[PDB]
């Protein structure tokens, strides 16, 4: 019962090798190959298919299928047809063909072309070619790392869009900004603990907690500069980039770093609004020793340490923690930029309106004192008010601009990341389209924009530490040195 043979005139095998494997027969036909009418032409069409040498999971199941349709066995004026299971085994791994161009009519599993349950002479042939992937991709087995319809390989950990030198330059930029920001916030923490007995008043001690946030946030940024520490945070066990964390196949070094960075930076950002409110209500009672914040201290912490906690947990719940090779940390919204609109631009924008409101309102009250009471208090007192008004002015200008910078950088990624993703996809297609049978990336993110965006981040931490850059703090450390 030969449901698997069809009448055809056997021709002599002009090629005794199919995709790098020996053939146990010596007769073929172009009957099954509807796109070619000659062995030289069918062999040429196999060169085009050879581009699928990448993405091993499809190359392993399509090799037998091709050497059974283009170079099938012919004996006694009879050609052997491929089995239907041999054809079904290619629709899954090789779903990319249907996307890029579409399968040919003679390669679709049809009963007239691929009957169910037939012997295959190619099943006895050993194909040594396992499948090599281009430079940007890397071999991996876990399905959660495969590039879109490229089953068998994922994106290498080191960002393919930037070179080794561009990675080294960015790391030096972060090592420099991270160290100064870490040392500046530490200087604020030290001056507070050195005089904690008096500094622990809350209209001012809030600065201690803001610098504490940006300090811890800087620790997560500087963690990458350890031996083999960045590879543990950004990479996976197979050698591909991290994304969609948390998972169950990788470690926790990525989600750990993210919580240190996102929670600390968001906590310090909301501390800014609490500070502006504290300044706003303290100025209303200026001129007296009355404390309007006598019973609002605990309420401040219960609101500043819980908001960033709900936000962080929400990100972990939707699993949008990604890893970047250039920055050296794990953050939210790297892969899918939409999430960075609600978990970054939304909290930052809100603290700019409410925080900026109290900031402007607080200066108005400080400006009314100079006008409502002229000549009552002068000398040092008058200088302290103007110097504080100027200190709050340069501070709001600085925060307003850094938020403008962040919104500019985010809108830049919102507008071109889709195009960036196309560029890399087309770059992966040409590599197999030109070589087997030079490429260049069309568009990539701007490193300058990334630095400008980090400048607004690190700049905020250094701006928070400038509030203790006074002559009064210098005396605090001059006293501790004497007692030593």
């Amino acid at each position, epitope marked *: 019962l030969s449901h698997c043979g069809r009448a055809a005139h056997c021709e002599p095998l002009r090629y005794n090798v199919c995709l790098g494997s020996a053939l146990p027969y010596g007769a073929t036909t172009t009957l099954l190959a509807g796109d070619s009418d000659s062995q030289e032409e069918a062999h040429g069409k196999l060169v085009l298919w050879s581009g699928l040498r990448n993405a091993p999971r499809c190359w392993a199941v399509i090799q037998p299928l091709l050497c059974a349709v283009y170079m099938p066995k012919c004996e006694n004026d009879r050609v052997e047809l491929p089995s239907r299971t041999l054809c079904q085994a290619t629709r899954g791994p090789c779903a990319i063909v249907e996307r890029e161009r579409g399968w040919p009519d003679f390669l679709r599993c049809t009963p007239d072309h691929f009957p169910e349950g037939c012997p295959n002479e190619v099943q006895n042939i050993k194909f040594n070619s396992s499948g090599q992937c281009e430079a940007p991709l890397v071999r991996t087995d876990n399905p959660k790392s495969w590039y879109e319809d490229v089953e068998g390989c994922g994106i290498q950990c080191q960002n393919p869009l930037f070179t080794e030198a561009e990675h080294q330059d960015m790391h030096s930029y972060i090592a420099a900004f991270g160290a100064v920001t870490g040392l500046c916030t530490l200087f604020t923490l030290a001056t507070f603990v050195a005089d904690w007995r008096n500094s622990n008043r809350y*209209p001012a001690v809030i600065l201690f907690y803001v610098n504490a946030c940006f300090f811890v946030g800087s620790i997560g940024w500087l963690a990458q500069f350890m031996d083999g520490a960045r590879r543990e945070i950004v990479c996976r066990a197979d050698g591909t980039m991290r994304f969609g964390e948390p998972t169950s196949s990788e470690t926790l070094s990525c989600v750990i770093i993210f919580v240190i960075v996102y929670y600390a930076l968001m906590a310090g950002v909301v501390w800014f609004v609490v500070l502006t409110y504290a300044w706003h209500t303290s100025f209303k009672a200026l001129g*007296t*020793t009355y404390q309007p914040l006598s019973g609002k201290t605990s309420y401040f912490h219960l609101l500043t340490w819980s908001l960033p906690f709900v936000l962080t947990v929400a990100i972990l719940a939707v699993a949008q923690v990604d890893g970047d090779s250039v920055s050296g940390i794990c953050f939210v919204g790297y892969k899918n930029y939409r999430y960075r609109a609600g978990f970054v631009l939304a909290p930052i924008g809100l603290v700019l309106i409410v925080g900026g409101y109290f900031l402007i309102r607080g200066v108005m009250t400080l400006f009314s004192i100079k006008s409502n009471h002229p000549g*009552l208090l002068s*000398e040092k*007192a008058a200088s*302290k*008010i103007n110097e504080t008004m100027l200190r709050l002015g340069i501070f709001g200008f600085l925060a307003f601009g850094f938020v403008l910078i962040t919104f500019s950088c985010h809108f830049y990624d919102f507008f071109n990341q889709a195009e960036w993703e196309r560029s890399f996809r087309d770059y992966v297609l040409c590599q197999a389209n030109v070589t087997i049978g030079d490429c260049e990336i069309k568009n990539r993110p701007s490193l300058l924009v990334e630095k400008i965006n980090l400048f607004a981040m690190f700049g905020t931490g250094i701006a928070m530490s400038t509030w203790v850059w006074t002559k009064a*703090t210098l005396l605090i450390w001059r006293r501790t040195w004497c007692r030593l």
Partner: nanobody
Amino acid sequence: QVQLQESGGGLVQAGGSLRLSCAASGYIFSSYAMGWYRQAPGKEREFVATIGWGTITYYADSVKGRFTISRDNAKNTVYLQMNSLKPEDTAVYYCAAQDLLYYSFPGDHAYWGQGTQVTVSS
């Protein structure tokens, strides 16, 4: 830097009146906000009253009504007129002279006095 010196404290009976004063050794009396505080031998420092630039004044809940605060800009002295004293008012009343922006910024300092005990007998 200014040094304060309170006076007028002493033992008194319930329902009586007392007048405490706070003299500040130093010409800088206006550029500093001042107020009265009290601390019992087993309690934290409690807020009493304060005086602003004009008629602005703040009092505690258990103090408002009975206490009265007034300043003498010329004599660099702040007064606290206590009336109808209750035994629960027994405490060492202190006098603080702090910078205007003392609460909001760590660079500023607050200067306190020695305090005077005021005991009320039932």
